[PDB]
Symmetry: C3
Subunit: 147 residues, 3 copies
C-alpha cells in the first residue's frame, strides 16, 4: 500500500574535477527566493529545484546538485565513466553558455544531479563558470522512479 | 495515505495582451476529437491536453490554457513578470511558427498553462496567430507536483 | 478506491516495421543486456525506464518500435489512416544516431508500443532502424504518463 511523502529541501550546489569523482567543492549559497521540494508516492519521485546566486562559481568541468531527494532507481554502470542517469530538460532565468545547437539539460543520477546540455540524444556536462551570466538562476523539474 | 483521482476535463483556450494580465479572451472551440484529462495520485499530477481547431485565433501575445487540473506547487514570484513555472515540451500536429533554433514548449503555472518556445533554457510566449497553419492542433503532456 | 503500487522489471522487445501504422513487425534478436528496464505504476500514473544495447544495427526499416508489458497509455484512439496519437518524450543516446538537422532525439509513446524518432517544431518523425546508432546502438527512454 502506497505512502505519499512531500518535503521542502535545501539543494546543495557543488562542483568537481570531472563527472566521475565523489570529491566535490561546496558552493556558498546566497539567500534563496523559491522553495525547492520533492514528493514521492509509491516509487514515483517528482522534484523541483530552484537556485539563484549573484556570482558564478570558479571554473570546474562538473556542476552538481546534492540533496535528500529520492535516489534514482537504475543499474550502476562502469566506474570508468559518468554513471548512467536520466536526462531531462532544465530552465534558465539567467542565460548560460551552451554548445551551439544544444538544449539546456540535467543528468539525474542516483548520487546527484549534473547540469549540462543535450545534442542528438547525448548529454554533455556544463562547466561551473558557464551556468549563467555574471550570476546564475535556474530550475530543474523531473519525475523518475526511486529505489 | 494517498488517494487517486482521474478525471476528463474541458480545457479552455484563451488569449491575453501579455503574460501577466488577468484580462483574457476565451476562444470558441470546435468539436474536439481527443479526450483531455488529468490524474492526481498523492501530490503528483499528470495532465493530458489536446485541442484542435479549424481557424487560428486572432493574434495576441499570450496563448493560455485554463482548466480544473491540479494547481502547480510553486512559490509565487514577482507580479512584474510572468509567474515562475515548469517548462515542458509540447507536440504540434499542425505546424506552428517558432523562433529560429527553438523547440515547442509550454509554461505550466499555478494559474494556467502558456504556449511558447524554448531556447537555451529560456521560455518565450508564442503569439496566438502562430500556434498553427490556418488552423491548429496540439497536445501538452506533463507531470508536476500539486498544492 | 485506494491506490496500489506495482514495480516490475521487464524485457523490452525491439521490433521494426514497414511503416508507423501496420501490425506487421519483425522482432530483432537482442544481445545480452547490461542495464535493467523497468516500470512502476501508482494509481493511474506509469513511469517507464528502458535501456537497450546492441553490437549491430537492425536491417533498415522505417519504423523502430519497442513492445512490452508496461502500462498501456491512456489516450483516445485516433484515425487508422495515420500513426496513432501518442505522447512525445525526449530520449537518450549513448551511441550516436543519425537525426534530421535541427531535430532532437525523441520517442512516441502509444498505447500499443513505443516508437523511436526525432522532434522538430513540435512534430515527431519516426527514425529508421539503420540510423538508431553507429555500427551498433545503445539508448534509453524515460517517461511518465497516465495508464488505462
Ligand atoms: Cl511482446
Amino acid at each position: 500500500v502506497p505512502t505519499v511523502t512531500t518535503r521542502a529541501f535545501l539543494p546543495r550546489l557543488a562542483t568537481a574535477a570531472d563527472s566521475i569523482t565523489s570529491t566535490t567543492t561546496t558552493i556558498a549559497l546566497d539567500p534563496q527566493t523559491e522553495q525547492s521540494y520533492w514528493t514521492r508516492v509509491g516509487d514515483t519521485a517528482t522534484i523541483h529545484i530552484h537556485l539563484v546566486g549573484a556570482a558564478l562559481p570558479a571554473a570546474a568541468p562538473s556542476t552538481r546538485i546534492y540533496g535528500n531527494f529520492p535516489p534514482l532507481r537504475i543499474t550502476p554502470s562502469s566506474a570508468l565513466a559518468a554513471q548512467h542517469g536520466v536526462i531531462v530538460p532544465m530552465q534558465y532565468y539567467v542565460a548560460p553558455t551552451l554548445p551551439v545547437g544544444s538544449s539546456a539539460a540535467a543528468r539525474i543520477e542516483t548520487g546527484f544531479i549534473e547540469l549540462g546540455s543535450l545534442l542528438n540524444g547525448a548529454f554533455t556536462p556544463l562547466a561551473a563558470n558557464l551556468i549563467g551570466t555574471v550570476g546564475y538562476e535556474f530550475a530543474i523539474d523531473a519525475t523518475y522512479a526511486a529505489q
